[PDB]
Amino acid sequence: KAEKDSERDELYAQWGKGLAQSRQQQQNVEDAMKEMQKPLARYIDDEDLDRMLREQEREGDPMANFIKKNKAKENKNKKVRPRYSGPAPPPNRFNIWPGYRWDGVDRSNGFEQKRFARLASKKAVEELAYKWSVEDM
């Protein structure tokens, strides 16, 4: 009856609001609450930002080995669902990682790549047009 189909169709309704954007909204609202309970001005001594900048792992350093060691040690112990692993996926404008059962082959139609080219080209043409305007001036 109404109760069974309610279960079914509410599940389908979230799945059509598909989960990822919903959990992103979740972390958004909790971020907004955390913040709203803080002053308007963020300094450079604020414990949150100091700590974050400490853990900010930049290049070159041989601490990186020990620290990647720490975190790859611990996060091994997780109940995660599998993630894709293999030759790097192509780049897409939203930075979305393939599903864990993608068979590696890249089947696209050549659209992401021509988009990337279009954007770089508009940059080049903007430099050229600036140069020519002022050259005449």
């Binding site: 990822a20 393939p98 864990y100 659209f111």
Partner: protein
């Protein structure tokens, strides 16, 4: 109007909006921002779920799969409904997979507005 023209027209939609220089917010996909369901059609009759997923997982995790097969013989009718995990992946898939040849058959992709479960 055979389905190959329905492919050609979606591709025309893309490249026309490109020529016009539309911003990513008023793309024709923006009318679909509340649905993570794409329809695939033209599929060959031998592809299974395993294949549809191994192909279309390139752009996200796939949450639901619905391959519509004729009830009497159980064989695929040749089209599918597919629910990605983030709407943006449906953007990507419609732009990228509409018009690829799988085993000669040139399959076609497009969003779904108000999907009704079966």
């Amino acid at each position: 109007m055979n389905p190959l023209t329905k492919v050609k027209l979606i591709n025309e939609l893309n490249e026309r909006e490109v020529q016009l220089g539309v911003a990513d917010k008023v793309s024709w996909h923006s009318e679909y921002k509340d649905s993570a369901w794409i329809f695939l059609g033209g599929l060959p009759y031998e592809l299974t779920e395993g294949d549809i997923i191994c192909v279309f997982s390139q752009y996200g995790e796939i949450v639901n799969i619905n391959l519509v097969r004729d009830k009497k013989t159980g064989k695929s009718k040749g089209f599918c409904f597919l629910c990605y995990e983030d709407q943006r992946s449906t953007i990507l898939a419609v732009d990228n997979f509409n018009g690829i040849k799988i085993k000669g058959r040139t399959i076609r992709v497009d969003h779904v507005s108000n999907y009704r479960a079966p």
